[PDB]
Amino acid sequence: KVFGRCELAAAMKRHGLDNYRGYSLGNWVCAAKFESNFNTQATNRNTDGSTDYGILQINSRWWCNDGRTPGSRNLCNIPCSALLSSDITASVNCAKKIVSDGNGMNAWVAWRNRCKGTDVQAWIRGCRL
């Protein structure tokens, strides 16, 4: 599924991500825009053999199982394929564990490099929420 911006904002709020760990909804929308361009099916292989999955590009090195990432963990206790669903529940639930791991949203390098410190409210500007 390719979400619209406000559509994604609304789903993320529905699943409790807005102000989760103090991160406003525009931060989450901005991270999803530069991680996946709002496409739930996005997958990208890392140099190290892990893969990133879904709207928030969650990495098989630590968070999900894809059976081909030797030495990796599965801390969200889910198959990585679940993170490709049109329903973002599994990606949100995992993202809540990631953002609680201690480095907040810096766990998403595209959030640090392209969202952190910017006017992230523009990502929800205009949205009926």
Q: What angle do CA 89, 95, 100 make, to 5 degrees?
A: 135
User: Which residues, 81 to 100, sit near Cl ion by CB under 5 A?
Assistant: 87-88
**86, 76 in Cβ contact below 8 A?**
no
**43, 52 in Cβ contact below 8 A?**
yes
Which does residue 54 bind out of Cl ion, Au ion, none, counting CB within 5 to 8 angstroms by kind? none
Residue 117, amino acid:
G
User: Is residue 52 flagged as an active site residue?
Assistant: yes
Of the candidate residues 1, 2, 6, 11, the single one contacting Au ion (CB under 5 A): 11
CA torsion, points 19, 96, 33, 84, in degrees to nearest 10? -140
Q: How many other CB atoms are there within 10 angstroms of residue 46's CB atom?
A: 13
Of the candidate residues 1, 2, 6, 11, the single one contacting Cl ion (CB under 5 A): 11
Query: What is the total count of residues that contact Cl ion (CB under 5 A)?
Result: 3
Which does residue 104 bind out of Cl ion, Au ion, none, counting CB within 5 to 8 angstroms by kind? Au ion
Of the candidate residues 32, 58, 80, 88, the single one contacting Au ion (CB under 5 A): 88
**25, 19 in Cβ contact below 8 A?**
yes
Binding site annotation covers 66? no
Q: How near is the Cβ of 37 to Au ion at its closest, in Å?
A: 18
Residue set of the binding site: 101
Residues that bind Cl ion (CB under 5 A): 11, 87-88
Kindly list the catalytic residues. Answer: 35, 52
